[PDB]
Amino acid sequence: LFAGTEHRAIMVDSMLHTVYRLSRGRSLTKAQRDVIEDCLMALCRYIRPSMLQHLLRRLVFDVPILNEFAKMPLKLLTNHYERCWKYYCLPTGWANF
Amino acid sequence: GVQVETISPGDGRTFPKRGQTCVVHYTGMLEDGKKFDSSRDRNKPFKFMLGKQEVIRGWEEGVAQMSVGQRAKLTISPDYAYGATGHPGIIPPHATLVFDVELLKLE
Amino acid sequence: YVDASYSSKAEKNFDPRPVETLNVIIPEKLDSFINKFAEYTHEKWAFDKIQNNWSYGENVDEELKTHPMLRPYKTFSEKDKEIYRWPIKESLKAMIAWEWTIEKAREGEYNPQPPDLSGVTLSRELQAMAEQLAENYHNTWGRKKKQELEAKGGGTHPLLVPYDTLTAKEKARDREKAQELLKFLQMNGYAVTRLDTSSIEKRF
Amino acid sequence: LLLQTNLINYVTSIRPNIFVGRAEGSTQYGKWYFEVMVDEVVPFLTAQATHLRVGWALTEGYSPYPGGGEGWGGNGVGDDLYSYGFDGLHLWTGHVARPVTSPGQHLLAPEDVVSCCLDLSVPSISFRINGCPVQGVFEAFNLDGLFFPVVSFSAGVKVRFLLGGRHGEFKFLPPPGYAPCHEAVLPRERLRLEPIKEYRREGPRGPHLVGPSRCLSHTDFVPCPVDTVQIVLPPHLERIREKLAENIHELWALTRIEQGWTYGPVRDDNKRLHPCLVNFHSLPEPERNYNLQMSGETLKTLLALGCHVGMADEKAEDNLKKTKLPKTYMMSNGYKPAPLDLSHVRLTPAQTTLVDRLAENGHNVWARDRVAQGWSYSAVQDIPARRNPRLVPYRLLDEATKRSNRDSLCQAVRTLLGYGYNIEPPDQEPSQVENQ
Amino acid sequence: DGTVDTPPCLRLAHRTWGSQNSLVEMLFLRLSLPVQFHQHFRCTDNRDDPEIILNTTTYYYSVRVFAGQEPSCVWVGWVTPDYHQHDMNFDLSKVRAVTVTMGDEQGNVHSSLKCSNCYMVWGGDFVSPGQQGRISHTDLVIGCLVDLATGLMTFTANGKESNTFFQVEPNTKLFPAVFVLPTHQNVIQFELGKQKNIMPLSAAMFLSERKNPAPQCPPRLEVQMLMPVSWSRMPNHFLQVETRRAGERLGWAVQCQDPLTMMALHIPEENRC
Numbered sequence A: 001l002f003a004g005t006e007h008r009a010i011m012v013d014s015m016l017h018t019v020y021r022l023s024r025g026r027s028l029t030k031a032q033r034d035v036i037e038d039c040l041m042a043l044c045r046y047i048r049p050s051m052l053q054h055l056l057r058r059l060v061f062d063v064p065i066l067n068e069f070a071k072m073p074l075k076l077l078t079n080h081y082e083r084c085w086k087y088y089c090l091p092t093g094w095a096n097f
Numbered sequence B: 001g002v003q004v005e006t007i008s009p010g011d012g013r014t015f016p017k018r019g020q021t022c023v024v025h026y027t028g029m030l031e032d033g034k035k036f037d038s039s040r041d042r043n044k045p046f047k048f049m050l051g052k053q054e055v056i057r058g059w060e061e062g063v064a065q066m067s068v069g070q071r072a073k074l075t076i077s078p079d080y081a082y083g084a085t086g087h088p089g090i091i092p093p094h095a096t097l098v099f100d101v102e103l104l105k106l107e
Numbered sequence C: 001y002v003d004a005s006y007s008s009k010a011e012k013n014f015d016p017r018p019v020e021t022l023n024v025i026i027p028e029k030l031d032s033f034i035n036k037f038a039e040y041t042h043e044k045w046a047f048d049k050i051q052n053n054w055s056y057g058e059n060v061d062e063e064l065k066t067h068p069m070l071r072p073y074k075t076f077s078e079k080d081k082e083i084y085r086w087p088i089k090e091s092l093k094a095m096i097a098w099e100w101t102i103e104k105a106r107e108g109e110y111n112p113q114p115p116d117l118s119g120v121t122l123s124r125e126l127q128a129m130a131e132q133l134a135e136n137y138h139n140t141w142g143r144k145k146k147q148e149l150e151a152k153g154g155g156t157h158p159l160l161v162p163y164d165t166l167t168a169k170e171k172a173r174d175r176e177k178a179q180e181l182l183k184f185l186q187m188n189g190y191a192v193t194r195l196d197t198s199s200i201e202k203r204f
Numbered sequence D: 001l002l003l004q005t006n007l008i009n010y011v012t013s014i015r016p017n018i019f020v021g022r023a024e025g026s027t028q029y030g031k032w033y034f035e036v037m038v039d040e041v042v043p044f045l046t047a048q049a050t051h052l053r054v055g056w057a058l059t060e061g062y063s064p065y066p067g068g069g070e071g072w073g074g075n076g077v078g079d080d081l082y083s084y085g086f087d088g089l090h091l092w093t094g095h096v097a098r099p100v101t102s103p104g105q106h107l108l109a110p111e112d113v114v115s116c117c118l119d120l121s122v123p124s125i126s127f128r129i130n131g132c133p134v135q136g137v138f139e140a141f142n143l144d145g146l147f148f149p150v151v152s153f154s155a156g157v158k159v160r161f162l163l164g165g166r167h168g169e170f171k172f173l174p175p176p177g178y179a180p181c182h183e184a185v186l187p188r189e190r191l192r193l194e195p196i197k198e199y200r201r202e203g204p205r206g207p208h209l210v211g212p213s214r215c216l217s218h219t220d221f222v223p224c225p226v227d228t229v230q231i232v233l234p235p236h237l238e239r240i241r242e243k244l245a246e247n248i249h250e251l252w253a254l255t256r257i258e259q260g261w262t263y264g265p266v267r268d269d270n271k272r273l274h275p276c277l278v279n280f281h282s283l284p285e286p287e288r289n290y291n292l293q294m295s296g297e298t299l300k301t302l303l304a305l306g307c308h309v310g311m312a313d314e315k316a317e318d319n320l321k322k323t324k325l326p327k328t329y330m331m332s333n334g335y336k337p338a339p340l341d342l343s344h345v346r347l348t349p350a351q352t353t354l355v356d357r358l359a360e361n362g363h364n365v366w367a368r369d370r371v372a373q374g375w376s377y378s379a380v381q382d383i384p385a386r387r388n389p390r391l392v393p394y395r396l397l398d399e400a401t402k403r404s405n406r407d408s409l410c411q412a413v414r415t416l417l418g419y420g421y422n423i424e425p426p427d428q429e430p431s432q433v434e435n436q
Numbered sequence E: 001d002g003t004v005d006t007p008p009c010l011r012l013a014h015r016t017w018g019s020q021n022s023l024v025e026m027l028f029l030r031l032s033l034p035v036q037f038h039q040h041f042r043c044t045d046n047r048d049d050p051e052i053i054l055n056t057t058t059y060y061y062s063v064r065v066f067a068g069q070e071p072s073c074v075w076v077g078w079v080t081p082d083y084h085q086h087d088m089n090f091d092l093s094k095v096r097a098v099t100v101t102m103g104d105e106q107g108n109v110h111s112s113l114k115c116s117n118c119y120m121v122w123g124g125d126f127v128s129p130g131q132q133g134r135i136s137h138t139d140l141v142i143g144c145l146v147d148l149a150t151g152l153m154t155f156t157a158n159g160k161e162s163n164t165f166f167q168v169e170p171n172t173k174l175f176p177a178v179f180v181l182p183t184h185q186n187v188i189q190f191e192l193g194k195q196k197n198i199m200p201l202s203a204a205m206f207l208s209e210r211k212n213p214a215p216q217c218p219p220r221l222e223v224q225m226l227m228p229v230s231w232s233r234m235p236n237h238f239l240q241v242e243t244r245r246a247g248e249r250l251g252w253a254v255q256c257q258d259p260l261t262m263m264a265l266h267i268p269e270e271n272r273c
């Protein structure tokens, strides 16, 4: 249902940052952590690539550290660019995106 | 109230007189540009005799000034046509009539 | 793909380290520019008022939605003039601390008749220093912003990001401020000096 | 209120492929003249009067489609604001007929000759019928396009275009200063009569659908050489700039020797006498300096186009073979001119593209210089009238002359490569003109 | 709808302004019904005078440029039914114009008529060169006056008469039209009102309302936009034109003999078939 949330991009972006910040949370059990990670993966699969710009900006600062917390963002980035490669590579961009 | 503006010259010698049948081809439009009558569409020339008041008085003077074979443009003021009463369903009241008349022959 | 900003800090949550210049002595041999441009930036604010279509006033008021203490130089108190120079003072400290010597090639010298604009272009080497200075504007801005925010330990300001990471729309604040200072140094002839890569070599 | 119905005749327009216009710095002449002679007109082939109008129309906007349109259809010349017609009795523009006075007014009839004059300087359009002036002129109209002769007609007409020269002898002498329309034909096209923006035409196996037609603009006749204000040549390029003029003169002299030119005090093409046809040094220095301005631009345009050029080799300049004219192929003087021998020189395919761009710029620089001097394009050369067949932008030039300029620039590039100077082909920047 | 203090209006709004994928381009608007000048022209508080208002031939309409829409991107005036200029870089210099000059046997110009398909004023001529604040607090209300008995057209900026004016020939049809490049959610507003002793547009567009001074906006009156491309039917047969070079001295001959006729359906108010 997050496919066409362009009109509420400010709230959606805040939601993505909060769930991502929850994933990088101490005192979280392994079972709880994967639920947060699964939610973040699901959200980024349907949200338009243009609305993921701010989340990517945060990931640029964190992923190159390559600590134990970098495992989930690596998988998140892999799925994002594989799905939305036309958005970045083709001069005309992805269709209707 | 008839002004005769020439379109194509005729012989310039023979003119219709009283009691002589005039054979003409005409196309009549209102002065704003709306056509209402034309003998070309019926593909039959219109015949009338001068002096018998068969046609509107504007045609009486207008055709009399033309020569055989001449094509002219006659602008008739409302007074020299149907005027205030007009032609119901065809010509509105107080309408100036413009005619493109060619005098084919006299008989 | 060729990145417009083909440069990096090559450094290393996020802690923006400012530039230490209070420890080192500030050279005052160019004080003819230090004091003049310090009040010239506020002088440009007077020109900003006539563009706001609301003029300057003497009485303090919140209804004019402008600077309430902006006064003509005949009746302009120097108490505000002697406190508005501080941002310029550290601005000159900042650009001279990064091993960038400044030399006065030339030797000379209520409305700011000379108009300071920012729509003109400039050379790449000199503009790169201005953008680096604009980065120092942001990290110092980020430093003081995060000091108030760090008392909680949860959450962060949305603009607490490295200067290269933030887009241009949120960059124009520090970008124009650094460029405007460089534009003032341009028409007067201040030479500050501490690459040449073609577009083909900049491709990914 | 109610929709109106009536029977109307189809009207079609026919034009020559002659396009003239006015623009700042344009190479086109300003005053043009043509005639249309009427041979056969049936006044009433149908119930509606036969259509026949003569005048000028603008390329950008005059697109009469068959069938319906403004007013009661049958749109021709003067039925819009892009065309200006004359039917013998009225001046037509904007679908409005305005009566005009001429000696012996009558609708266009057989044996009538209509003279149309177009003076883009005012601008003004004037007509003459059978030699007598028509007391009515169009003026102060738009100039954002090209003007072409046009006749609009219905069925039952037979007219002939008189364009002057070998394309219809004029019945009446054109007014002074006006040029026959046949002189406006471009070098790459042959004069012909064509419809206007047709979407359909007859073919061998059936009707052919036709898309939009590429049309020129009034700006296409304005030469646009690259900017050479930045006059900063490297010192090694500056010194070799004058030497380049020496070599190209010999190559230009050598090609004239193939054409049969010999040495002579007078410089005439027909007499085939040339003072330069002895040697580059024996060539007078002021005459050598005539193209020194052009020679300076040739190296400057290399910097202007973005090419990276420097004195890569100096020993190559010191030692190089000199090709000399054969003793059998001698001029009047009998000496052997010695242009630089560059047979060993080879050019990359990218460098060949640079030669094409250099040739295009060189023609445009010469073209705009002639325009400032008052020269204008004409199919027939007229030196006293400053009319030149090559006074056209390089893209509109014919391939025969286009190749000739390309060969000359190739030798100049070969001369630079003969000296060993590095020539870097610029990374070409594509662009989309969007003419339409 | 027209309130006690406002006349009936036709307001244009940009649905997707500000958002992504918004379309911003020159917009050519006109009202669906024209005003036609008389066949013959005449020789040579705040309450309407009953005798003046019933004998006047002057009609008025105004366009309100809302705050936020730049006046420099607004053109207000009239268009003839033969306007087909869909220019994305429109300005008053692109307007088609031509002067037809008549004279006697030797010069002596006795008639110089001026023809155009677009009689408009530029919204940028009604703004003072203030230092800034060009997006004004007050909306620009450009008024247009047409006298059907004299062919004279005048304009008002904010109640102040403008210097520009136009003269047209009798029987001319003019459509109220606005050319605007949107720069705000609220773009323009056709105000079909009236002035003192001046009839509204509804009095001129409709025969039954000639003597009705009350402004009206009947359903037939609507805003129309200029569409660059439309479907057209190809004729089944085309004129057979023979073109050939008759010779060096005879020139190029054009010939067409076989007649062709079509039955045309004419729309009166649009003056097209």
Ligand SMILES: Nc1ncnc2c1ncn2[C@@H]1O[C@H](COP(=O)(O)OP(=O)(O)OP(=O)(O)O)[C@@H](O)[C@H]1O
Residues within 6 Å of the ligand: D269, D291, D294, D362, D363, D364, D366, D367, D390, D401, D405
């Ligand atoms: N400096 C130049 N002078 C003349 N033509 C030049 C020059 N440089 C290039 N050209 C090219 O030469 C052609 C026109 O030359 P032009 O008609 O002047 O030759 P010409 O009649 O042999 O010379 P001249 O007028 O000196 O007797 C064009 O293609 C133009 O681009």
Ligand SMILES: COc1ccc2c(c1)CN(Cc1ccc(C(=O)O)cc1)CCS2
Residues within 6 Å of the ligand: D249, D250, D252, D253, D276, D283, D287, D288, D289, D290, D291, D294, D362, D408
């Ligand atoms: C590219 O450059 C060109 C191209 C074509 C021509 C010339 C120079 C030469 N110009 C006149 C000229 C002729 C000879 C000399 C000389 O030999 O010194 C100098 C100028 C016009 C004639 S065709």
